[PDB]
Amino acid sequence: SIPIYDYQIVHSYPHDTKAFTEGFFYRNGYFYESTGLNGRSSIRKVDIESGKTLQQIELGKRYFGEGISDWKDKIVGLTWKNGLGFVWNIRNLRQVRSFNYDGEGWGLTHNDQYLIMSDGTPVLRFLDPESLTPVRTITVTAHGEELPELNELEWVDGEIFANVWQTNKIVRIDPETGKVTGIIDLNGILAEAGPLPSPIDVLNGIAWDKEHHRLFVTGKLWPKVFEITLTQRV
Numbered sequence: 001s002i003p004i005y006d007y008q009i010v011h012s013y014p015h016d017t018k019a020f021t022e023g024f025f026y027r028n029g030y031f032y033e034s035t036g037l038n039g040r041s042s043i044r045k046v047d048i049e050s051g052k053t054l055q056q057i058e059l060g061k062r063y064f065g066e067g068i069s070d071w072k073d074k075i076v077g078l079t080w081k082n083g084l085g086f087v088w089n090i091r092n093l094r095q096v097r098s099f100n101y102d103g104e105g106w107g108l109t110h111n112d113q114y115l116i117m118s119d120g121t122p123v124l125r126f127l128d129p130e131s132l133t134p135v136r137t138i139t140v141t142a143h144g145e146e147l148p149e150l151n152e153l154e155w156v157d158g159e160i161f162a163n164v165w166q167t168n169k170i171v172r173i174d175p176e177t178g179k180v181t182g183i184i185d186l187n188g189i190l191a192e193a194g195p196l197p198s199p200i201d202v203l204n205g206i207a208w209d210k211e212h213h214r215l216f217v218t219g220k221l222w223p224k225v226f227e228i229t230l231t232q233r234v
């Protein structure tokens with residue numbers, strides 16, 4: 001009754017196996033990743049093919065960085081427990097503004113009007129990109145059930161794709177109703193990943209290139225980012 005989708009790997013690119021991926025998006029032929037690298041949080045511009053870093057800033061010691069997303073000429077980023085967000089110039093990564101919000105920050109994406117954030121609960125926040133305060137929320141449900149643990153996000157083709165932390169699934173959420181309209185099953189994808197690092201952590205990170213319709217998924221300490229297409233199951 002809830003349509004399930006299987007992946008096909010189109011390509012697979014090296015990813016930093018030391019990087020706890022907290023936020024991930026695609027822009028300008030580049031990856032942008034919010035990364036934990038030994039308790040320190042950095043934000044990073046990655047070359048897609050090499051997985052190498054082309055540019056980074058570090059967050060201050062007291063912040064744990066989470067979701068990131070572009071917005072026009074900016075990167076917006078969340079913190080885990082600080083209630084503080086940042087706005088950077090996407091070009092030189094110089095901090096430009098801070099803002100406050102309640103609760104935790106996990107994932108962050110955007111559609112044409114709004115920044116969209118998760119925080120591990122079933123409740124997604126739509127933010128005014130200007131005031132940076134919520135104007136709508138939706139509650140996320142799968143077969144009528146509240147779906148908590150919503151993590152990294154990505155707006156894909158009219159929908160919110162969200163990692164569900166500690167599963168290998170991605171949910172497609174109708175932004176209007178908050179209903180899960182679809183489930184992407186990435187179980188076993190790691191078997192396709194080449195030799196695994198020690199340690200390795202969980203699926204998390206979805207980026208999308210609107211122009212070419214390319215979907216990229218990764219995860220914390222993963223050795224690959226995967227470009228994937230979807231096929232609806234049987």
Ligand SMILES: [Ca+2]
Pocket residue numbers: 023024025108109152153154205206207
């Ligand atoms: Ca994302």
